[PDB]
Design a protein around this ligand. Structure first.
Ligand SMILES: C[S@@+](CC[C@H](N)C(=O)[O-])C[C@H]1O[C@@H](n2cnc3c(N)ncnc32)[C@H](O)[C@@H]1O
Length: 188
């Protein structure tokens, strides 16, 4: 799990150097009116983005298993005036949402942190509508002059395999700005 006392590392405007937030989202299919789930919301860094992209009509559920991250992200939305965002306290494999409520699922740098992936994936489909798109973004499994140790992350290869076990269908796997990759998946 990410360390709560290092949270400022998640609220660093220099993260933009990894990839353009709305360029990537728009390309992965996030649209106005869509209800999006932000799994490891952390500091709520990408929240201003997701918020903007769904607009007045959409909604953003920002979850996180850690209470400190939840309250930090919350103060963030209020500080910035993000009215369509709902920050919630999550449990490892349980999302506090009713079935078929999400259109877009965004998982930024949080997949490799899941205790029990395929079990979390099942919980994910539940809250996910029959349609639903899954956008998973993470670090490459090599060595980089900017990201965490490789044994600490999955490689695009492993991830998309797990998704397969879980039943999710992967359609695209593209590099994301020199340090990360991204995966396009649709929930069945
Ligand atoms: C790399 S950090 C996220 C940083 C954030 N995505 C950003 O872009 O600034 C990963 C977050 O995942 C959360 N996390 C770990 N397991 C989780 C789970 N099963 N459900 C929800 N959040 C989880 C942690 O509390 C941690 O803050």
């Amino acid at each position: 799990k990410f360390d709560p006392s290092k949270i400022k590392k998640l609220d660093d405007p220099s993260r933009l150097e990894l990839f353009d937030p709305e360029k990537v989202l728009k390309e992965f299919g996030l649209k106005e009116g869509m209800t999006v789930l932000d799994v490891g919301t952390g500091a709520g860094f990408y929240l201003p983005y997701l918020s903007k992209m769904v607009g007045e009509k959409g909604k953003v559920y920002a979850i996180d298993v850690q209470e400190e991250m939840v309250n930090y992200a919350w103060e963030k939305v209020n500080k910035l005036g993000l009215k369509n965002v709902e920050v919630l306290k999550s449990e490892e494999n349980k999302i506090p949402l009713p079935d078929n409520t999400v259109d877009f699922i965004f998982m930024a740098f949080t997949f490799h942190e899941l205790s029990e992936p395929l079990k979390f994936l099942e919980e994910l489909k539940r809250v996910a509508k029959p349609f639903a798109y899954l956008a998973i973004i993470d670090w490459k499994k090599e060595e980089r002059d900017k990201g965490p140790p490789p044994e600490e992350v999955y490689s695009e290869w492993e991830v998309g395999l797990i998704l397969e076990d879980a039943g999710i269908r992967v359609g695209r796997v593209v590099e994301v700005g020199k340090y990360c990759f991204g995966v396009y998946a649709m929930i069945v």
